[PDB]
Symmetry: D3
Subunit: 149 residues, 6 copies
């Protein structure tokens, strides 16, 4: 029942990786509980990157994330926060192992295809930020085969 | 620039087919312009299936679409309304071709995984219904390789 | 609940297509009820192809099937007999459409990868012949999403 | 010519992963020498898990493995025992690397999809238990390109 | 031993479809006998499209084929000419069937991803023009499982 | 703009892995700049392996590489030399991780499917030797989405 925030970045949209990314999370056994394709504006972007407001690359982060639509998602499951980062791979795509999303698809840190919450507290914050409206809840018929007890 | 409405039905979500379906439209070269996971309510379901209100099965259609979340999508491209439906495949399982979405995944007309607009006219209507908020516009850098001129 | 007999021929095994073929039936929503890797003896082969003993290429069918192990399967589902044949594609892989098993993988009628029962009465005979030990029964937790009611 | 015992557990069957799993071993270049779908009997399962008999989670293992059919397999090839384990991934899916079977597909240690022999000695034991009748026989035409010498 | 000329057009290259296209011919059982990535020069293009010199779309064809590199190939196998064309699918994207290359990837007749010889006579001519240096020869270890006799 | 030499060995061609290998490089975001199917002649093989001329296994290497056609390629991108080797996986398939080319496909060090340049120095020498004719020039429409700036 842990939940995490996964965002496909503008480059992930442009390079036609939306379905592929979602499939990795689906096949893993995680539950998609929220999803929307959205164009972000500066003021929202500034809130998402709030932790980095004092960084000199802050403006570039904001300039980029508004330059194309992104796909915002909430995924739910056991250890989905840390396992979500494992699926995504390392920060630098070139250090990311084949088999991970960044390992298979990315080469440039500034074009790293996807974002995943770095921690349970970051996730709760990110989810409240991106999905004020809440989630589209459901119960998977495969629950008893994905999970024990 | 033609657009169509495409919905992954409750069985599509439950059977873990969301990414696979999206990948097929992406690889075809179509542009995703709206996307969301939603739990549908009765009156909205009744509006969506309005054309069938006098049919005996109308109630069943409504009950089912409200029984689980769906993925609502808008796709844009040349002839996307009919080509969208070609990729989806015939309604009747006996008539579906291997290589289409229903040809590959569906065995029951009542569990047909996905549904696309019949016409430009009905698409316009479905888009206005499902996405009052409008679309997330963008321009693909692959445009000049997908389309001539 | 209808069932059909599906057999991967010795060329299917040799060309490493066992998993791919099984995945196709699984993804379609059919239920695997029996499965084994078998070396076939001539008298058994002759029983399998009994309804063809009068023909000249009867010996040809028989020799082919004893030339290496085969994978014998029972698949269960709505219209699985006809649908099984549709997925397999035309007998002459030259006429087989891309998206079918023979359309994707085969070029020669004498190496056409796989066999599916041609009718319900043939399926019942074949299942009785290959699996007198019975089937492995189970209920899929995805049943209510693959089938209506 | 080394051989190992690989078993797709009931959740692998239910989640439709049979073909995918077989494909990974085929593509690696390993040779399938035995295959059956089976419903496991309780006293048989108690034997298979004997080495864990005095462990706490022992009865749970026994209860679970007879709760649905499994796919029992023998695979042959150089270092197939250790390499089969490498393909399968870490026991705890929390640790399993993307690109491995459990890394790609599993989230719960109690629903970890598949089993492979842990050593040559376990393999011999498991193979004698599950396939007392022995193996199917064949020689791959790809042998001289998979192996040297 | 029949051979055909298959060429991936600049849009096929730009959209990253090179490996995918080659895979489809490999899996079918055909033999790659010649292969090169090449930039095409205007007068060579004029020669390739010579038979269309009187047509008003001639110059557009010439401009387009030289706007990017192409992957020129020779494939060999039974009925490879007509089957090559079948794998490629209909010229017009409103007609291309899902499961074919154009069916799966193309939406515009002017950006149709790939070319295949339309007849044995055309093949022979194209092969002589594009590969006067001849072919690379080899024999596939899979020949006896792809072909009978 | 760094470039590397990647060669699919005879076993990779025989096993029908050509397209699958190319796809992995395309999907990562690298640019194919040279590609051809070649029958290597003894004196050229001796040049390619010149660095190992004093090794006892030198003649074995030479014998193998001329036994069947290879696919020679040049790929370009950020850190493509080291990244190429990462995608390919460990030299010994006992160590190669699932997700890498050798991880997924190879089991014998002597049949390790593919080779990539081990350094920028080696890559330059290899590119000069295999592609004296030079590289294809083109600019990917995806460049601004693969690379920042």
């Amino acid at each position: 029942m842990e939940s995490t925030f996964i965002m496909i970045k503008p480059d992930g949209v442009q390079r036609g990786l939306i379905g592929e990314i979602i499939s990795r999370f689906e096949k893993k056994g995680f539950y998609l509980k929220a999803l929307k394709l959205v164009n972000v504006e500066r003021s929202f972007a500034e809130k998402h990157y709030a932790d980095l407001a004092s960084k000199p690359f802050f403006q570039g982060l904001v300039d980029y994330i508004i330059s194309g639509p992104v796909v915002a998602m909430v995924w739910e499951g056991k250890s989905v926060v840390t396992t979500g980062r494992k699926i995504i791979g390392a920060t630098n795509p070139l250090a990311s192992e084949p088999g991970t999303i960044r390992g298979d698809f990315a080469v440039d840190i500034g074009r790293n295809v996807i974002h995943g919450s770095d921690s349970i507290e970051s996730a709760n914050k990110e989810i409240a930020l991106w999905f004020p409206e809440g989630l589209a809840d459901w119960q998977s018929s495969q629950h008893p085969w994905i999970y024990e007890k």
